[PDB]
Amino acid sequence: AALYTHHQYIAGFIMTGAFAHGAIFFIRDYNPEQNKDNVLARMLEHKEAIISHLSWASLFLGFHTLGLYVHND
Amino acid sequence: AHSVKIYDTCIGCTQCVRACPTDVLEMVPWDGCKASQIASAPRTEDCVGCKRCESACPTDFLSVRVYLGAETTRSMGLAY
């Protein structure tokens, strides 16, 4: 139990740090002229769709999980 | 020690200088918008970061921008 809990919390912190440093890269290391129309630029080109669909997925999952749990309660 | 900047979109509303409670922003003759007026920040050594300036300029995004930099006694607003 201790081993599992330890390693899972470490993994959570590490997965958060990966995105933190991705954001730092985007802020202070990304050159929009060299990265002209590659995949990394097209990720910024349509980020609204990505955020919208992640929003929808999270809302759907939360709504339905909470609904079923409260119904069983 | 904060860095104030006045980009060339000020229509001379004079509100930035009216709002700043430190006598930092002042008007200056500069032809080009309507009335040959523009803002100017000569006394940036006194800005605390109030951002009352930016909350007044009715431009598209903004024309006066404050960038918070090195902290001092004047900019921290201390009285002790």
Add this chain to the structure above:
Amino acid sequence: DVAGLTPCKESKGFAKREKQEIKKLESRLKLYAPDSAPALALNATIEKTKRRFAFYGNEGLLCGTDGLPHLIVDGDQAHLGEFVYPGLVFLYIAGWIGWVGRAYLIDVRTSKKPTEKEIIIDVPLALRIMSKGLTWPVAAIGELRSGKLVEKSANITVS
């Protein structure tokens, strides 16, 4: 059958989940006279319990090792009455709501004060659109085919 669950009308654990509840209700019932409002309410509750337990077994749900129904949301033809049959009618109702709301917004947007018509609804037009919103799939697919469903000049900006 599927997933190692037995049908509920043969589950020897459903019988207990029924008789224990029945006996609890009867223990509650024996504290009054058979001609008083509590006794009538309790007898109604017992009849409702019997009517409920004599419907699950006849439907075909699979009970568990603890005597509780389990829903096979799989697509199994022998179990369409659990997920896909109610899911289709729900999707119908939800598409109805969304389509009539979208159409009301589209119609209101071309007016004098469109922001006024959103805190103060105009019931005639809203009712008209709600009525016409019965055949929404035949309208949504028609708007998709005709290229009228989506815009292209969206106003997103990022410097």
Add this chain to the structure above:
Amino acid sequence: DFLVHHAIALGLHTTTLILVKGALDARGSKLMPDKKEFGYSFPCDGPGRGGTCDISAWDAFYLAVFWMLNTIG
């Protein structure tokens, strides 16, 4: 196990939503389309323009840490 796996999916989805929103709108958004010039972690952009508290990408990470801890819990 079904319901807990769906709660786990919801947690993962919300955490990645926060982190991806931060990493993407770390260079600039409509509320503040010069965020790249201010850096990674800055408190806010004043009370004006409706209120821009808690706007940086470091704040996105700070909000996502809570959801990471909740998912791992």
Add this chain to the structure above:
Amino acid sequence: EVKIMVEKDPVKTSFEKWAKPGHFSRTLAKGPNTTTWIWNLHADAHDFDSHTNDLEEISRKVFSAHFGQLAVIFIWLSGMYFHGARFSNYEAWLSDPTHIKPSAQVVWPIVGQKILNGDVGGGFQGIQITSGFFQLWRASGITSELQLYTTAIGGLIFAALMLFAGWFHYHKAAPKLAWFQNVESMLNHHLAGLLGLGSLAWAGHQVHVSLPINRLLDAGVDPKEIPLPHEFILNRDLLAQLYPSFSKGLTPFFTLNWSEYSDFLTFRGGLNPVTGGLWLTDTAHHHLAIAVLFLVAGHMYRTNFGIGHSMKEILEAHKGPFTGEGHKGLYEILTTSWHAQLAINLAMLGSLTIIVAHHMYAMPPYPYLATDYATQLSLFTHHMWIGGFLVVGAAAHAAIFMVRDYDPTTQYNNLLDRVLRHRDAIISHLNWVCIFLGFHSFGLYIHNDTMSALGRPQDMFSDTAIQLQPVFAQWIQNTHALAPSLTAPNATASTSLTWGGGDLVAVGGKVALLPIPLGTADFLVHHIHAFTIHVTVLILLKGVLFARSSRLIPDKANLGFRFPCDGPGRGGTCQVSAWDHVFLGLFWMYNAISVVIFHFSWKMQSDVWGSISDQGVVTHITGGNFAQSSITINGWLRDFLWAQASQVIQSYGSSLSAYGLLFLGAHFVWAFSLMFLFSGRGYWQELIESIVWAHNKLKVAPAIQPRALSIVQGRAVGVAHYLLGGIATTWAFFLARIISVG
């Protein structure tokens, strides 16, 4: 001078201002450009002094709003009476008040919720109420459902009446500012007329109907054979059968020989030995005395009849050396500003609610009240919460006054000015005493916890180890225990049974009250109470004093009472207004009141309540484990939370199921509050753009642009959800515990 002042028909009643949603304020009457219009509409919907500027219209609106509030209260009361009449087991309760649980609410059988109608007794099935209305009706003399029906209708009538008045005095005959300002006559009439005559009328009702009916109920007769409340009015002989003093007519009262009224006008401490409540023959005398007190006290202030005091010569006359120009210029503050009056009224009413909550549990005034533990606990907790809210409201309104009604051009009167001129000292000393109290109260608990954890209990602060016996409270208890012999020769017994004197009283099994001991475990918790109260006063007083200006922001009064922050400059100025100080003080008020109610619950279940058996042996509910287990935080965790929380959690499938559901519901709401309390507006405003994009992509963009909640509304929502969750959790826990085990 003092006269009636009315302006005939100042506002035409119509529906024009009714169709335009925003009409009171011109800033938002135009229309909802963005969605932060729907919010501030309801926000400043009741900001009467913000819409307009003249005190006259503000006063008229205040008057009519008071009338509407009174109408709503009347509807509430008539509803409670109608429910006690139609869906209650009251008549069955009257025949056996010790085995029948009160209940005045039934639930329709729709979706299986029928099981909420638990078996309360008497052939009834419904939720068991805890309002204490059954005891109040039993003490009033109400003995039949009919006598409830009528009064319900009565309430309804008054409701309509109030509404009528509310319309009238705003649309047909509204007064003018000069009329409201007559505070002398207003106080005269509220002292002599409202309180005095009200107390006299209630004393009359008591002495005429409530005494004989309740006495016959104590003699063990059937509540159906008791004569009706008017057979004692049209028959002085039928009433004199119990109190023969009535045979002497109204003569003793007029010849000053009224020492013969000692039958029904008594002075006896203690409680009635069979009902576990005060003697109504004592409350009648109390009301009779209070009535004449308020009546003779209602002749102090001057009206147009020559005599009386004036509350301006009284104020200016008090002006000492230390305190500048005395109370000068305060009569001008409390007659030209509605907020400086609301502050004092809210503070006094909250403190009075706390006093009421402390008095009622110690001197039960209704029959069979101390026996029903659930009612006696709910009546404490509810009133405590009400007072705790009202005091914070008083602080908030004092801050509002200081922000936008104070002006110095007339306030050179050095009483408010002088306290404003050493705020940096007041707050500094309050901060120091808060720190001292916090340490010397909570560090003792931490010491006890560490010692009991290190296997060395001999170094603790228990009642066996180093002792902290509160000597002053013990001396006060011993002094009040001996009062009926030395310092109160006419009172037969002490005022309460909580004093060390006296003995135990039983109501047929369960105990009502007994002398309460006070050890170290009480010393610690009383000091904790003092510490939390001090911190709350610190926050609220700091906000009130620095509402105008400070070293950080010298022109804060220009910004206003409610505003998020003055930029991220000066290091940071977030949460700098007085509204934010009220926001911060709400949490500490919640903390304080929660600690108080936990104290009361555990101490009562441990050292007061219980069920005595024959030969005298009395076993309390928990078993007297408060003196020893309440000195360590672990003890409050297991012996109070973990142990007593074992009734609500396993209440599923029983008549107490709704409490088990609302436990988790309130937990969810409390945890939901943290999303608003921790986050900030910028992240959500940015996230909303990526949803508006998906909406535009499908042509479902609303015309009312979806802006995110303002920086102040986020805090408001957070604190509201926090308080709701916490209080509802404690509500469910307390009720699910005491209903089952009490």
Add this chain to the structure above:
Amino acid sequence: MFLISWRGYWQELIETLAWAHERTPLANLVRWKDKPVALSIVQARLVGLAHFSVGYIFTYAAFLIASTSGKFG
């Protein structure tokens, strides 16, 4: 404590605490070098998150070890 209450209250408190220290005898012989100020905004968020995380980790490590090892399954 660090996530609900924000800086403008604590700075206005420190400004009077400094007064109280300066205007007392027998204690103005000592003197601070660094002017006492309230924690910054992002600094307050960081300290709050650190406390939240340390508590979250500790009160669950203790529970998972005690409830298991006290019974050993």
Add this chain to the structure above:
Amino acid sequence: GPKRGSIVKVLRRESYWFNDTGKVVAVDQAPGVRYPVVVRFDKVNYAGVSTNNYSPDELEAA
């Protein structure tokens, strides 16, 4: 620049009204103005204003 009462679509990358339409009010015809075109929009921004001035090369779609 453009005509009065003409419906033009913005191209200013840091504008709230980017890729949105608006009708010109009155373009100033002075010699040294850097942003003479004045356009009013039917949706306020985060600050609440709906009028803004651009340069003729910064917005045109008709």
Add this chain to the structure above:
Amino acid sequence: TPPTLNADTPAPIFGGSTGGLLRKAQVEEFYVITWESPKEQIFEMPTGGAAIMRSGPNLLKLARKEQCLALGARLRTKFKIQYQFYRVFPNGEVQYLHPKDGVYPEKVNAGRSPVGVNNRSIGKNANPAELKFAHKQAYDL
């Protein structure tokens, strides 16, 4: 214009306060504000409390600059009174600040230089990823 010179004008009547000067004023800068009034009114102090200004000249020393500007704006708006304020060092070196050229910073004035004015639109600054290992930030250019 020649900046006005300080003097020993009297001070407004005030019974004291706990929001006055501190040790910062004897080891660092501090400020002093003057004005001229035609009568004797009651004005609110920016440090808490009220004071009665005197007729003719008045001189008031405070602890920050923002205090002086707040009081001066309140004067110019409510009493229609013109004012100046200075900054004084420990060694008694007076420095004249607010009406630096007589005209307040709102009205335009000749002989004023533009400071911090960029000849471009705010949305044109280069990214912070080309000017790395080069301390030019994004906007000083």
